[PDB]
Design goal:
By secondary structure, this protein is of the alpha/beta class. Helix content is 39%, strand content 21%. The protein has one domain. The two termini are 34 Å apart. Bound molecules: chloride ion (CL) (2 copies) and magnesium ion.
């Protein structure tokens, strides 16, 4: 019945100064205050009897205007042994489908569809079919061209995955995007596995269609269920992270679900949001100290 609050800043805008942490912990009459990383993250055990609603509200007031995230959770079982993470705009800085669209001269057209799909204003599968149809005829050569020149890893990603693995967790990159991207990205970052949709080609060029059935919101829920049974755990043993509406199913099922840099409509439906930190925030969410990290 013991709660703990964690405050988290981006290491590139590390504003969680020692005085700010003290003030924050005072704001909740905390038992103590433990630094997971200097100027970046600290744990605050809430007094027994304080509801999770009072803190967070109390802590977001005291921090109002600083780029510092607030999460509250039970301290037991906050370290998870499964990670399931979306790729597009979560572990990479880009939307792979928008990047491919540029090679067809249609970036802005496709990207506006992507934004509504990711906000939940249109269903994923028909949005994906519409966007991929515009890629018809692109040569298979442009995939590596996109990956090598325009895809970048989100800060903190490798360290999150590697540190979780170091501690025995099983880590999976699941994506409504494309296996030709997740395969390379998952290896760059160090995931144990990846699972994504598949572009159809004729042997030289993209047909403009996607292998059916299309993996969407429920396919992420099902992959989390599948991973947990296979490693002999439950989804409660997983932390799930994404930015989009099609991530909310796995975010809501996992024991710890994080909306990471999500738009307000998506972030409204997640119990835990990270708007400032990078992916190391999920390490601090789980109680890790910077000493425990794989550097
Ligand atoms: Cl593919
Ligand atoms: Cl939950
Ligand atoms: Mg995404």
């Amino acid at each position: 019945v013991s709660l703990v609050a964690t405050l988290i800043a981006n290491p590139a805008k590390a504003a969680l100064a020692p005085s700010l942490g003290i003030k924050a912990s005072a704001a909740v009459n905390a038992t103590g205050l433990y630094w997971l990383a200097d100027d970046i993250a600290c744990d605050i055990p809430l007094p027994l009897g304080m509801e999770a609603s009072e803190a967070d509200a109390s802590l977001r007031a005291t921090l109002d205007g600083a780029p510092i995230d607030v999460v509250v959770q039970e301290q037991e079982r906050r370290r998870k042994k499964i990670l399931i993470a979306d790729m597009d705009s979560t572990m990479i800085g880009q939307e792979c489908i928008d990047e491919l669209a540029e090679e067809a001269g249609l970036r802005d057209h496709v990207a506006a569809i992507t934004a509504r799909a990711m906000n939940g204003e249109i269903a994923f599968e028909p949005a994906l079919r519409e966007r991929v149809a515009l890629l018809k005829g692109l040569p298979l050569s442009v995939i590596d061209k996109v990956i090598s020149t325009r895809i970048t890893l989100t800060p903190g990603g490798p360290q999150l995955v590697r540190t979780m693995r170091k501690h025995g967790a099983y880590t999976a990159l699941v994506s409504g995007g494309f296996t030709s991207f997740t395969r390379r990205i998952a290896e760059m970052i160090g995931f144990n596995e990846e699972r994504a949709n598949r572009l159809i080609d004729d042997g030289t060029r993209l047909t403009g269609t996607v292998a059916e059935p299309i993996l969407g919101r429920e396919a992420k829920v099902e992959k989390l269920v599948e991973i947990a049974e296979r490693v002999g755990l439950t989804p409660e043993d997983a932390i799930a992270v994404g930015d989009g509406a099609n991530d909310l199913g796995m975010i809501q099922l996992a024991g710890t679900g994080v909306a990471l840099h999500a738009k307000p409509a998506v972030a409204a439906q997640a119990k835990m949001r990270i708007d400032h930190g990078d992916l190391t925030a999920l390490l601090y969410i789980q109680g890790y100290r910077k000493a425990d990290f794989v550097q």
